[PDB]
Ligand binder design. Structure first.
Ligand SMILES: CCOC(=O)c1cnc2[nH]nc(-c3cccc(C#N)c3)c2c1N1CCO[C@H](CN)C1
Length: 251
């Protein structure tokens, strides 16, 4: 008996998606994260998702999600430094795996940032929080997006200037920003607009300035392909997996 019973142990973190608590099983001592609260969409989308690099959904207001004891990728990033290139590559590999999966089933997260990339006990990356996620492909038919979603430093430039835009390049772009944050310990701009000096400098290719200065030429080459303003000219994920740094053996 008693297997259905969980003890709430500590609050893990907040949100206007709701407060999150740590549940531990009375009997099995298994640990899950319980969300405390649109909300029907998050639950619907969670039910589609099964992948090593996506936070696991257990059931259900109470949402039952995989507990990631490693915390946030955000906390493995030393300010102004970043992290060791090999760790960044590994994390990036796992992020790509997760995003390839999501896009595979026609779902875009829309808010990819280190705070939403959690780590398990073995430091495997898991994409978290699908409260802003939406379907972009259904019955093999793509639907453009038009609603502003996400976080300014991470959003693609077309999202600020276009009425409609493809969902996938947006996720690729924010992944690029994450890669940057991982290798330099800083975000390049407040937002990708032409009134942002930093973004202007990047478009003019002044990579002798931070954060690009702190980034090796190989990863920077990849970033040169990801952070392209025109979403049509931007590298897709299949080609990211052919990039030289992506395939560079690192220790
Ligand atoms: C070790 C502590 O880390 C956490 O706080 C944490 C652990 N496991 C989690 N699984 N799912 C979440 C999570 C977080 C935020 C939103 C949603 C949704 N929907 C799920 C989670 C953890 N978060 C708890 C709240 O604060 C952090 C936000 N990423 C981490």
């Amino acid at each position: 008996p008693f297997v259905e019973d969980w003890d709430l142990v500590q609050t893990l973190g907040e949100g206007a998606y709701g407060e999150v608590q740590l549940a531990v099983n009375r009997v099995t001592e298994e640990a899950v994260a319980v969300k405390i609260v649109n909300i029907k969409k998050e639950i619907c989308i969670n039910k589609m998702l099964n992948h090593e690099n996506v936070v696991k959904f257990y059931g259900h207001q109470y949402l039952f999600l995989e507990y990631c004891s490693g915390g946030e990728l955000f906390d493995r990033i030393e300010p102004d430094i970043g992290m060791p290139e090999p760790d960044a590559q590994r994390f990036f590999h796992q992020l790509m795996a997760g995003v390839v999966y999501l896009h595979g089933i026609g779902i875009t997260h829309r808010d990819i940032k280190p705070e939403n990339l959690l780590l398990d006990e073995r430091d495997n990356l898991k994409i978290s929080d699908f409260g802003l996620a939406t379907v972009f492909r259904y019955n093999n038919r793509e639907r453009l997006l038009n609603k502003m979603c996400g976080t300014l430093p991470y959003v693609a430039p077309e999202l600020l200037k276009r009425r409609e835009f493809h969902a996938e390049p947006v996720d690729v772009w924010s992944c690029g920003i994450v890669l940057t944050a991982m290798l330099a310990g800083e975000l390049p701009w407040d937002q990708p607009s032409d009134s942002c000096q930093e973004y202007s400098d990047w478009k003019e290719k002044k990579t002798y300035l931070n954060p690009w200065k702190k980034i090796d030429s190989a990863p920077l080459a990849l970033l040169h392909k990801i952070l392209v303003e025109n979403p049509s000219a931007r590298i897709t994920i299949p080609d990211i997996k052919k990039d030289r740094w992506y395939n560079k053996p690192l220790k």
